[PDB]
Structure formats: C-alpha cells, structure tokens
Design a protein around this ligand. Sequence first.
Ligand SMILES: OC(C(F)(F)F)C(F)(F)F
Ligand SMILES: OC(C(F)(F)F)C(F)(F)F
Length: 6
Amino acid sequence: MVGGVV
Ligand SMILES: OC(C(F)(F)F)C(F)(F)F
Ligand SMILES: OC(C(F)(F)F)C(F)(F)F
C-alpha cells in the first residue's frame, strides 16, 4: 500500500 499525501 502507498499512502496518500495532503
Ligand atoms: O490517508 C489520508 C489521505 F487519504 F491520504 F489523505 C492522509 F491524509 F492521512 F494521508
Ligand atoms: O482540509 C484538507 C484536509 F482534509 F485536511 F486534508 C487540507 F489538507 F487542506 F487541510
């Protein structure tokens, strides 16, 4: 899994 960035 690759987490999102805000
Ligand atoms: O999981 C959240 C998302 F979806 F990427 F915005 C977080 F902001 F925490 F990264
Ligand atoms: O409101 C956004 C959230 F939801 F926190 F990701 C922002 F990144 F802009 F802060």
